[PDB]
Ligand binder design. Sequence first.
Ligand SMILES: CC(C)CCC[C@@H](C)[C@H]1CC[C@H]2[C@@H]3CC=C4C[C@@H](O)CC[C@]4(C)[C@H]3CC[C@]12C
Ligand SMILES: NC[C@@H]1O[C@H]([C@]23C[C@H]4C[C@H](C[C@H](C4)C2)C3)Cc2c1ccc(O)c2O
Lengths: 236, 128, 340, 58, 273
Amino acid sequence: DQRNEEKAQREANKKIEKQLQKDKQVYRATHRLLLLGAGESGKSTIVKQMRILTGIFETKFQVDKVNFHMFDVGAQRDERRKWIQCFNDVTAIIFVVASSSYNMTNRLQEALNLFKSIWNNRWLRTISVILFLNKQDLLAEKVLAGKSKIEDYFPEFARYTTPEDATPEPGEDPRVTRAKYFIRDEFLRISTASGDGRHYCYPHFTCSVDTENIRRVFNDCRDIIQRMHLRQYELL
Amino acid sequence: QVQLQESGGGLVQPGGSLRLSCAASGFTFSNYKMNWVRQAPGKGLEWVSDISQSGASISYTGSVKGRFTISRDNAKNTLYLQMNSLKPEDTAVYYCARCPAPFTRDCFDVTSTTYAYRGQGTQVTVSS
Amino acid sequence: GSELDQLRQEAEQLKNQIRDARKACADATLSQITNNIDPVGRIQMRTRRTLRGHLAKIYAMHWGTDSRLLVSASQDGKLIIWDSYTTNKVHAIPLRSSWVMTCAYAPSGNYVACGGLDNICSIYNLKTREGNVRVSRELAGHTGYLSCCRFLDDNQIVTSSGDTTCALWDIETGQQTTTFTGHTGDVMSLSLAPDTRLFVSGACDASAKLWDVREGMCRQTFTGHESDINAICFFPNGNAFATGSDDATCRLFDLRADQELMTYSHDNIICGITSVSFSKSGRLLLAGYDDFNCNVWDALKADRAGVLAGHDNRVSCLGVTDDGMAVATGSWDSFLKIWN
Amino acid sequence: NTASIAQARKLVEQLKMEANIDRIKVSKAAADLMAYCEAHAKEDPLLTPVPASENPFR
Amino acid sequence: FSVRILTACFLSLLILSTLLGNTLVCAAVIRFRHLRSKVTNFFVISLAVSDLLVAVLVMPWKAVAEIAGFWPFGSFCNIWVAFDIMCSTASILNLCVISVDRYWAISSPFRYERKMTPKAAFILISVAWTLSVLISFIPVQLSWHKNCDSSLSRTYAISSSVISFYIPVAIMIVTYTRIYRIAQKQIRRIAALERAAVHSFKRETKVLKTLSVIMGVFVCCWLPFFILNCILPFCCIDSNTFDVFVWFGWANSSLNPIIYAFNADFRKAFSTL
Ligand SMILES: CC(C)CCC[C@@H](C)[C@H]1CC[C@H]2[C@@H]3CC=C4C[C@@H](O)CC[C@]4(C)[C@H]3CC[C@]12C
Ligand SMILES: NC[C@@H]1O[C@H]([C@]23C[C@H]4C[C@H](C[C@H](C4)C2)C3)Cc2c1ccc(O)c2O
């Protein structure tokens, strides 16, 4: 009548509330990571090297007792203006960009436009972007042997020089690092256009070797949440 | 109906000049971020340029930066794109697309064919 | 010889024919009776119940025929079914996919639909005698995200998609009997008529398409919009429907008129509409915009009857009961404000 | 180019199907609208203020 | 009744401002659940409720005693002093727990979200409040201090200020100097991208200014009071400076709602109500 069946309903609601408050810890402790790209940009090599373990949509892992969630979108259509709005609770948008796919199509400019749209998005305005300049080994030989040159799709590369924060490696040419940093700053040129402080970009150079790329994501999301809490507390 | 008719195009000599006039009817042209995107025969679409709701944040691609010029006119609801110093690579089908979100700076019209707001395009052919 | 250009020209000529035929029957407008019907006024709607148990952002919701239980899904892989009368989570299904975009409560109150970027629709059953809820049916035939879905009955359910192919799935066989091909942009939402014989779908091509579920063809099309139709809602009379898009204009189309009736736009609104739902009489129109506030508009006076406080984030989902008792607005702040 | 030809064929077929339909006047459309409103006005709990006793949410 | 009316009005305005700000924070928390849902705001609302409790039974009575020079409730003077100590040490412990929670969220945010659950926030708030209880209500029942003239003991006052202010203020200082060592690193990493995209310390001063407004205004109203409170039973000072130096710390309670509610969410919650 008034409480014969409503009491069991209230008990079930209390059990559901207990389950939800137990799931809240493992959910908020879990930092999702949206992974996307302009197309064949090496995201497969990124998701393949994830903890060394109906198609391939989402893969999960955990490092330093911090479970992440990497959702690949390598099956949705090219139109990203609608479903990407679902990624406003995500902690970081891992943008796996192939810095050598500009030859085949000018996919680098398409990735630049996608990054600009993600940055100026009304819902992704508070979400950082983990820029992944994938396919670095295929870029060095391209810019060295003249098979693929940045200046064909970028006029500013002739008016650009390597900054003071270069990271040289054994067996690398200064022109390769110059082109890599030029692409990085072209990605960074949109990151400072708005400058709302709610989100920042994080460039990285991967796919050169098959080492643990999850460390460059963990130590990146660390600073991501650091600056998020700093902007939240206004200590940034 | 959101229609965009891009008049112009044809045979072009390498290094000449060309003007496409995109008349967009069916919406408030003074409120969206219109953009021109090219597609080469045999390759995917290439984002060429975009313009703000008023004309402040004008941006071009690296292939046409300094050569092309995009200008929006709200008194006539038109988008004028001027190509200068044509190259044998600039030959392509040009589409005057519109990204749906207004009062914004993001656009997701760099996708492939079968787009919502995208005209049939003009086959800008570069002669010899 | 020259087939593509002549076909495009024929399509443009037929579109102009549709346009001037709509104009031929447009000898008047709904504003020509503004002196006959009286307005409603600034009605203050206060939050009666608040379902503060969601974890992630509440993306989609749908009421039931009993106007008591309401479903709501979030991106944390959870889908909670609340009793709006006592604010009690009757059910909580952990979805196999975290990101979900659609919700649908069956008219019988037994089946519940979810789905999202996982390209599958997970139909669950509630009245099972086995106790806990499990996956009753899985629908995997779409190559695009499931933006919205609506249950016709306990047997069939029509789901939108991201690849311009709305599918009428059958729970018995789990296979698409028909397909509503013809859209240009990915379908963002869809609504069902009270008679359930025909259903409308608002896509991102700025052209809401009204199809029929018996033959599977395109009955009507409406291209009077300017941006992605984020949400759609059939009028309770079954002859009209409102469409909320990103252009900050809610457009009311009619099936028999095959054109637009009113544009509930405003200069003080620069954000787009995210959800649209009619009241019991359809005179009121609940529109969840992107300005963190839900607006009650008048379907006749063509003005915003009022604005609601509460949500600080974007109000994504909105649902009015079958009897129009209490409208529930779920925003991206894991909150469900049940107005009245 | 055959895919574009098929898409244009489906589009012109849909346009032909849209052409041969019975379109009523927009005046009668608005009349049906306001008639349904005035028929369900006094029964709508959202339109008219519903008392707290008859409302299951107050 | 001619010159004391000015300071009377000043202290009444001060206590009314404390009451208004704290009631505003409490109303924004109990009505808007977008604030009492995050773990980091549990300590903020604990500081706010302590700031309300110090404005109902601590500062109004001191003001009504200072305006006329006399003091009512002669038998209740001991429990009133106990309430003052409790409220002050609770405010200081809430400041310290907010500081250490911010330090944990800035240094190791993943471990912060994994360990500092709402249950852990409740544990920390309860630990702070029980420390306040054992440091205020326990000594007054045994008369550990030596009209009801204000004079503590030379052995208990120093220990109470250490376990109540000195250790909390030391934790606050070390956390804000370890946060600054991380905030400056984040600012340098931001500059390394900003200056490179346009190819210094312009943003490095905003963090310094906010750390100032949240820490120096706290250590310039409580510490100037405690440096005299610990030396009072050892001797120095007079009755005309200590009573206003404690009002400085009580006005730090007026400035606190502006400190930990300057964020956008709290700003909107205050503007709407
Ligand atoms: C004179 C003394 C004994 C009275 C004060 C009692 C203390 C323990 C009470 C008074 C107000 C209370 C707070 C009021 C509101 C909240 C918000 C809630 O989300 C968590 C608990 C919390 C933070 C309470 C903790 C306990 C609290 C601080
Ligand atoms: N507001 C600060 C609080 O005040 C009391 C005290 C005690 C005596 C009677 C009253 C007037 C003087 C002298 C101050 C109240 C002392 C005290 C406080 C806070 C932390 C402490 O560790 C501590 O010792």
